[PDB]
Subunit: 368 residues, 4 copies
Amino acid sequence: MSIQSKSAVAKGDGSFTITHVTVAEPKADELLVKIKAAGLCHTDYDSLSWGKPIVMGHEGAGVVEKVGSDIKDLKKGDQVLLNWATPCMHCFQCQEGNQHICENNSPVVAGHTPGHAHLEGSQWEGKPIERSFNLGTLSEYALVKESAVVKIEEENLNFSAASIISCGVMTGYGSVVNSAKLAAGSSAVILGCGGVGLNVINACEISGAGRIIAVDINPNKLELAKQFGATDVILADKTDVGLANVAEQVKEVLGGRGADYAFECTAIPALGAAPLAMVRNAGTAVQVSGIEEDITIDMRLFEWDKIYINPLYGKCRPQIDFPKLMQLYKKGDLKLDEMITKEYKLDDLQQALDDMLAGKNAKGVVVF
Amino acid sequence: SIQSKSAVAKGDGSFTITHVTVAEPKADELLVKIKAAGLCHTDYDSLSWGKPIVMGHEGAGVVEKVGSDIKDLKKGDQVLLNWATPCMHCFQCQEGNQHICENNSPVVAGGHTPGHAHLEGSQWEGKPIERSFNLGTLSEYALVKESAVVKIEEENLNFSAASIISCGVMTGYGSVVNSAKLAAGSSAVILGCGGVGLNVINACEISGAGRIIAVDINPNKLELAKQFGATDVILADKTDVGLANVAEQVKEVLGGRGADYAFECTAIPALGAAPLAMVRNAGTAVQVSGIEEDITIDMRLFEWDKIYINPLYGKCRPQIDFPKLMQLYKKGDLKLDEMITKEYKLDDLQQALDDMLAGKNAKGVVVF
Amino acid sequence: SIQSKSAVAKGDGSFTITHVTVAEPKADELLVKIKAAGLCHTDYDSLSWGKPIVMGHEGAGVVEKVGSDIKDLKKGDQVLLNWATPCMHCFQCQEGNQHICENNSPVVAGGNGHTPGHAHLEGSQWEGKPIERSFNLGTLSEYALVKESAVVKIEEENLNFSAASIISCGVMTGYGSVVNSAKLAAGSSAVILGCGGVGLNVINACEISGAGRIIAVDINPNKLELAKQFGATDVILADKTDVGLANVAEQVKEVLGGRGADYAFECTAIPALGAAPLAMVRNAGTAVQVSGIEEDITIDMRLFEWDKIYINPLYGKCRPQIDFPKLMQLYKKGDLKLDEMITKEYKLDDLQQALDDMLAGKNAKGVVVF
Amino acid sequence: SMSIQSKSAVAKGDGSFTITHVTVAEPKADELLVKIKAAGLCHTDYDSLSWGKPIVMGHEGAGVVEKVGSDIKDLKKGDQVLLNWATPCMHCFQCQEGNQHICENNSPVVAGHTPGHAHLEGSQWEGKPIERSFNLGTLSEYALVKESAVVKIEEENLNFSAASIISCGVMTGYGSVVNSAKLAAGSSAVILGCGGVGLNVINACEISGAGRIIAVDINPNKLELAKQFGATDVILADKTDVGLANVAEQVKEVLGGRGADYAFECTAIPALGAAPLAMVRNAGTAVQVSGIEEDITIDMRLFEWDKIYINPLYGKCRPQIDFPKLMQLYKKGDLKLDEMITKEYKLDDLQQALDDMLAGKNAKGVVVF
Ligand SMILES: NC(=O)c1ccc[n+]([C@@H]2O[C@H](COP(=O)([O-])OP(=O)(O)OC[C@H]3O[C@@H](n4cnc5c(N)ncnc54)[C@H](O)[C@@H]3O)[C@@H](O)[C@H]2O)c1
Ligand SMILES: NC(=O)c1ccc[n+]([C@@H]2O[C@H](COP(=O)([O-])OP(=O)(O)OC[C@H]3O[C@@H](n4cnc5c(N)ncnc54)[C@H](O)[C@@H]3O)[C@@H](O)[C@H]2O)c1
Ligand SMILES: NC(=O)c1ccc[n+]([C@@H]2O[C@H](COP(=O)([O-])OP(=O)(O)OC[C@H]3O[C@@H](n4cnc5c(N)ncnc54)[C@H](O)[C@@H]3O)[C@@H](O)[C@H]2O)c1
Ligand SMILES: NC(=O)c1ccc[n+]([C@@H]2O[C@H](COP(=O)([O-])OP(=O)(O)OC[C@H]3O[C@@H](n4cnc5c(N)ncnc54)[C@H](O)[C@@H]3O)[C@@H](O)[C@H]2O)c1
Ligand code: NA
Ligand code: NA
Ligand SMILES: [Zn+2]
Ligand SMILES: [Zn+2]
Ligand SMILES: [Zn+2]
Ligand SMILES: [Zn+2]
Ligand SMILES: [Zn+2]
Ligand SMILES: [Zn+2]
Ligand SMILES: [Zn+2]
Ligand SMILES: [Zn+2]
């Protein structure tokens, strides 16, 4: 039979629908993956306003349903994590180790790319539909290129836990460990304790930060922050321009000097320079949200030797980073189980989105 | 109490050649007979700090008189001046960031410091007068702390060449070597080919950059850039907002990809984000001018993984870096002699300042 | 001139509990009332230096008396001691390498004699002769005369001075070897050869830094059980005959799935194992030799082959004023397990037992408390 | 399709070599046939005489594409190519770390034949497959290689002799300074052994901005060459100086009582493998470039204190990244490739080029076709 996969589709007018997408047999370098769990990221919300129809979802874990003619490393029944780098392995950036900004295949930096499965293989209302971030994980079956999958091998695997590795975990963890290269014993400030920020916090704790200050406008998020390793919390005011008041409090909590590292995770474009306010001179400020607007910045915030970086996807190298995360999860340091606040069914995607936006969840996941 | 002919900036935008009353040195201080004093763009800015100052923060000379506790200097020793005057004991000094010393930096801690000679030691209109950047080199005789000098030992020393080490050379060289850590074989864009920018260019050539693209609005400065290492020149539009036309030309010149490194040192506040437009993803953008204003930034310029840094004084560690610069001068790699465009007597400071702003000099020096 | 009960090594191989005359501090000096002193093998070695020594190079205490120039410290201040006593002005100090200070380091610049990091030689007298203090400190004493560069101020209620006293040497060395020297990255794999005072702190530091696998190796199975306390994920009983631990390297590759570890640390004090961490790591891995070896040894140079970084760091690249307060915070946070490292506390008059227990391998760390 | 009889230098596996013909066959889909224009000589080519198996010698070369396999789309007949012996797979753990030079699948050093080598039946001698040295075999009129072995360049009036030595001597010396040591401008550097590799180490320290560059050799002709490539200081070592201990004292003398920031050992002498440690100050960086596969005796005080010691392979070459950077440094005049070509040889005079190498008469010798 022709595969009819129950899916979430964003129509490109601002709204989404639960519906069915027709999914092909894989070409030679593609796989058919049965999704067991799909995580929800803030960017899925933004993806409703892209102005083109897409199968939604770019966090997901599952099992190989069927393999293309030229795939050797994978077979039906294999457990897999999905990544949206889908890197080409030959371009300049891939050879620098920057698989996450692959010049040919990145859905962000190149985009639909050769990291996307063949376009006609996914059909909605009898027409090809794009797969969000080359994946489209809010769907019973996803068609993906081989470079989208990382094979794992775990008994009694919690697939809801595994599904969030794909974005929130990898981005938050990689921003700490790959980009900032946070040193043990140091002080770290996290601005915004949501899907990404709670993983920055977890990763600061894994990395051995001596002080970890969590900042949010929502008191429920601060309490989650403590679960994942924050040593201090600061409730911000929405009216705190550039979080400048928070910066003075950080200096006071640390004894008169700014933090060694700060991470911005708020999804608020106006707060793009806030991590610079938090750090001492020669500190490291990492802006994780990604901002595509003009904003006004007091350039004094850059003064003096502060490193500022806006990294993509935590500098993800999927076949390298995902097994390292899996090992930290199994060891007990990476707290993926506790991060899954609620599981939902695909029909209740709206309630899951609302619980995310309302600040009720660390991470919500759709389970199939 | 000696009378030293000096350039004093009154706190109104104006200066006057006058006499400053200099006292004998305290136990940890020194009287330096200035042989040559370099001119920095910042000396122009210092006219409009609303306080009387003994101008000048670049200089070389000979030790005139030594205080009680000075053990390794004597009358007659050749010395270079530095304005870091580091305390050697605070957190930043112990980090090796002597240039942002939390106690003595005239920039970071002034706003004053123990890096300044005793305030009574320098007087004008019957009042203590401060010495620019703890130095005040545009003066026949300077009173300074020991941490302000670096002893050198040279035969037939060109004091003019030595005088510009104190700021323009250290800042430009250090921004490349200590702050950006530019790798041999890379591509580099330099925006602004002035006293700092020509030393950034020199330092890219010393460092082994494969392509060095010099950018200025003044054709005379581009011809000078070719002397110091530039392999390519771009004449910019004084009305190219954000230098976006220059970015397209860079990508064109480099074969379709942005540069590995870009350095901004135009003294134009609105160009503070410009080096980001010049570099590829994961490139390094260094903002050398130092901007204290609000400016509007297209935050897309930070996407993705670009390192942006605003270093102070090229991360100068004077007793370490100044001898390395002297060796590079002696070796023929650091082209100090070509940088000295004209030598002025103190009474002609105005003409020196005019030639500075008219773009007629790489460096002008005042000679005594 | 105050009289301080002290452990003096006589040089002949013996030591005695005695009293040592300690002057008031000159202007850059200060008198510390030692609360606790850690013990390690170096103190046994200071019995055979062939000159009378005030023993002890690990300690924590309280300022008793301050010299005329000291401004940072006052009577009653809690202090940790460090044996780097850096000068802050030489090339290495300006490089951030205070632990190898060209002027004051008792290891680098102490060539039989003592350095300017030592308090003035006449400030400590035994039998009418001036007496040298071990590593510029002499902490196995009720009152120690030291330079300001030797102490790091801290402020804690209910401070476990015994825990505090071991930061001075083994903790700094093993933690620093991981964090400052190897700069171990979270998620990686690490092998630790030798699980004594240094090695257990290497293991703790790998755990603190977030290694995904931590393989402990020792010839003493009791030490492997301890290694599990401090965070080891896997343990290997090494065979004392195994030359260069070639069998252990094979087992490491098996445990890890076919490739060497990212990092390996050698803490065995066995000269012939100096190159062993090379055998444990993959190509382009990092091999850290913590022991310090001064003998000629024969090395199969294929072990270096191919991009392995090899380093023999001193004192964990300690910058005392920066690193000791960070360690204190990790202790307060619960991550650095100082309390669990203290196997036994001793009286100064018990020093003979504490050295016997140490040489017998009975302790993780022994501490003298006053 | 035909079977080319390629005149070649073959090491027989008995310690000798011969000039002979090797049969080279049609390239498979991911392979290609290269007409060699020039082949450099590296000290390792002489070590390959002792490997105990027949090999087509040579692992430095530059040439033009003679024929492209079915699936090659980025190269055509006539294209200029530099050869590299990393032949990286691009998918293993090391390749994804950026360490294509120690590829776990394809490296002829760390894996080897490998899938970095062209199909084994494609090169034949005495009726049976013959391995190509370092997956290349450049001392031959035509080489059969994998696509991963070539870097396309385009340059009018290219000097192929200068281009041929990028393949090993230049990349190893340059990369050991810039990729491994990460030598910082203004620092002091000591180079032990001024040969094919050491002279490129010296060039790369000059390119990188070292303030002091101290060349050391037992051969006075090499010290004169070293000055051409940027040495500010030269020291004639004695063959009697165990560990180069007296040289170490003179390095400190020359640097005002202090050890150097960086030292590179390039001597091909196994007993000298620890020598760079004695040249450097505490927290200095010592780079052992030769590669030693023997037991030696090391005074372990040489490691004392924070000295980084490292034995890098092939200058950490990522050939598609590094080789274009080297080509640009050559074109702008900083990398002095032309000046490294001391003498050019016919293939039949390969014996003379090997004696000239071992006698120390050349910077680099190349065979031209
Ligand atoms: N760079 C990347 O590769 C990458 C990857 C994933 C997500 N993102 C981006 O990261 C951002 C955050 O993602 P998320 O899933 O964690 O979203 P989220 O909604 O789960 O978390 C946002 C958090 O920021 C808090 N916050 C809002 N305003 C604040 C303020 N003024 N001060 C302090 N805290 C404030 C919110 O309460 C919330 O807890 C999104 O913009 C998303 O697009 C980037
Ligand atoms: N970070 C530090 O420690 C430090 C130290 C010294 C100076 N500075 C700062 O560096 C800046 C430059 O100093 P300087 O002495 O080199 O000044 P300068 O006047 O000598 O040179 C500035 C150059 O920028 C050129 N320029 C102006 N507008 C341009 C444009 N739109 N595009 C391209 N080029 C343009 C000018 O033609 C001139 O050549 C000053 O703002 C100064 O305060 C910083
Ligand atoms: N670099 C520095 O600054 C510094 C500072 C302090 C101590 N050290 C040195 O570190 C070394 C270790 O000191 P320590 O106090 O931990 O000594 P220790 O005796 O307490 O521990 C050494 C451990 O190595 C084990 N071991 C012995 N042989 C072994 C083998 N063949 N294989 C595996 N394990 C073996 C032993 O069982 C013992 O547990 C000493 O040499 C000491 O001199 C160096
Ligand atoms: N790590 C790698 O990837 C790599 C790559 C190429 C070559 N190599 C190795 O590098 C080494 C050098 O190769 P090469 O082609 O430059 O050889 P070479 O023969 O051209 O040069 C060796 C130099 O060392 C000199 N020398 C000999 N003894 C000396 C001594 N006691 N003191 C000082 N100098 C001495 C010689 O006079 C000669 O100039 C070889 O062992 C070779 O196998 C390694
Ligand atoms: Na941890
Ligand atoms: Na250069
Ligand atoms: Zn996402
Ligand atoms: Zn790519
Ligand atoms: Zn200036
Ligand atoms: Zn300071
Ligand atoms: Zn000890
Ligand atoms: Zn020192
Ligand atoms: Zn070679
Ligand atoms: Zn590979």
